Design a protein around this ligand. Structure first.
Ligand SMILES: *[C@H](O)[C@H](C[C@@H]1CCNC1=O)NC(=O)[C@H](CC(C)C)NC(=O)OC[C@@H]1CCC(=O)N1CC1CCCCC1
Lengths: 299, 299
């Protein structure tokens, strides 16, 4: 079968803590003797509108940060700021700290989100970095400091920390160096994203998945050149397909006996005609948050 | 609205592998018992037509290889309860959570922690279909993977994976070994009944749309539960039970829309169609979000 699947979240759960400053509580990520969290926790209502973070931060003491791991309070023995992430040095090391790395993902890549509130894990789901550097998440008040991640063997690669919601209801955040994905800023203002586009290489991965699971009504006998497909793709605000994308799709191509450019001819027909009421893998819409690797691992 | 799974860490800490000869699947290690599908004791050729009691009497504790990772847990006792094997082991699982075993109803959702060789690979949310199948994602070696809900700190185990049906859906038991539906653990052709739409979950979805301001479909009329059930069955929708009416209670109260009034609105959508409109950004009515799922994502 075929399902939007997240990585098992245990290794990350054992890192989550609650961080409080003033009347603001959000989540932190406790790795070794450091807790990472969004810097906008240090803001008041008034601050949030135009926070001079270097200025606000210097006025805080270690003791203004309350960090709790369950019942236990952790003692902050130092604080600093790296871009939009606050780093809290604590007197004790997290024994549940996994093998980890910090990475910056590219748009079109997917990752798992462990949504937390008051330092407690609440749910896990799979998301993609949109081409306009938003993510379509499920994040409520208190969710800031929730992280996104991938797991390779025994290693957790952290790629996202959550900071904000935009008026359209999508979400924005940073990598674990504190740099935003996209043109956003951690200030309480209405911010719009660039126009989004659909992740074409992922739509093609998902069409291959629908074939692998016996769903092929959208196929056709026609074919297309790469550039002629890309011309139509861009017309419909789909990302153009690169030769690296073609190559990445090979295993799915091999496994199903459907040349990539044949699948592109199928997608072009769907873009131009629509789904005629039909569904693919249950969906009325072309799904673009499965990468080729996601589909491969799972089939 | 996304399908959101529960954080899987409390369950990851209970997964082991169970091997008889070369047949390896997953087991669930709680306190000093390991629970797994009984067909682990069957050779490939045994599965064609197994005699489980006879296969079991021939077995001894020392024919069972139970491993957490690569660490052996010695089996000191074995019994069969319906279609699950219970293996008493000489070590109480230090990671055992607060837990219980529950048998869920069609329509209820749970998270599945897909595992291979006792290693978690992925977590996703499933609904139990009215025909007592789940639309899972399971490969060879996945049996013994479990489905669960988490309430506060208590893990309620409701599913253990045993088999795949011709249509590519999946079937299994509760943790007492009792199959959901009319299936048996024999490698013989079996077929799921025709599936129906989960009415209580569609209703939850409509409540979700209203909570978010999308309420064009509300009408000025009501209906009896009996009239609705009779009409719904003509559209291959499940009849509502009293338990369904009850679990819609909070969403009814949150919106001020009586359950039976929402039923009349759904009847009108069934009889007259969407007339080209959308609800929550979709022309399809969604049926795998329960009233709890809606609450846990809106509030
Ligand atoms: C345990 O890991 C395994 C999990 C399976 C295999 C891959 N995906 C799964 O979900 N379970 C079995 O192999 C199971 C063992 C039996 C003792 C129950 N047998 C099984 O799943 O296949 C037999 C099924 C039973 C109904 C049926 O018609 N059938 C034949 C195939 C035909 C092709 C499509 C799938 C069903």
């Amino acid at each position: 079968g075929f399902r939007k699947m997240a990585f098992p979240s245990g290794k990350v759960e054992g890192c989550m803590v609650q961080v409080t400053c003033g009347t603001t509580t959000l989540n932190g990520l406790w790795l070794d003797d450091v807790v990472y969290c969004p810097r906008h926790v240090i803001c008041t209502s008034e601050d949030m509108l135009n926070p001079n973070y270097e200025d606000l931060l210097i006025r805080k003491s270690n003791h203004n940060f309350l960090v709790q791991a369950g019942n236990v309070q952790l003692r902050v023995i130092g604080h600093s700021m790296q871009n939009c992430v606050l780093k809290l040095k604590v007197d004790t090391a997290n024994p549940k700290t996994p093998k980890y790395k910090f990475v910056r993902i590219q748009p079109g890549q997917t990752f798992s989100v462990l949504a937390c509130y008051n330092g407690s894990p609440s749910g896990v789901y799979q998301c993609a970095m949109r081409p306009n550097f938003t993510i379509k998440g499920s994040f409520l008040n208190g969710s800031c400091g929730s992280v996104g991640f991938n797991i390779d063997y025994d290693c957790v690669s952290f790629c996202y920390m959550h900071h904000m919601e935009l008026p359209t209801g999508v979400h924005a955040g940073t990598d674990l160096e504190g740099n935003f994905y996209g043109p956003f800023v951690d200030r309480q203002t209405a911010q719009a994203a660039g126009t989004d586009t659909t992740i074409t290489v992922n739509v093609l991965a998902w069409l291959y998945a629908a074939v692998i699971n016996g769903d092929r009504w959208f196929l056709n006998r026609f074919t297309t050149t790469l550039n002629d497909f890309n011309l139509v793709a861009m017309k419909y605000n789909y990302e153009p397909l690169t030769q690296d994308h073609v190559d990445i799709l090979g295993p799915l191509s091999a496994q199903t006996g459907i040349a990539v450019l044949d699948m592109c001819a199928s997608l072009k027909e769907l873009l131009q005609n629509g789904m005629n009421g039909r569904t693919i893998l249950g969906s009325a819409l072309l799904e673009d948050e499965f990468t080729p690797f996601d589909v491969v691992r799972q089939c």
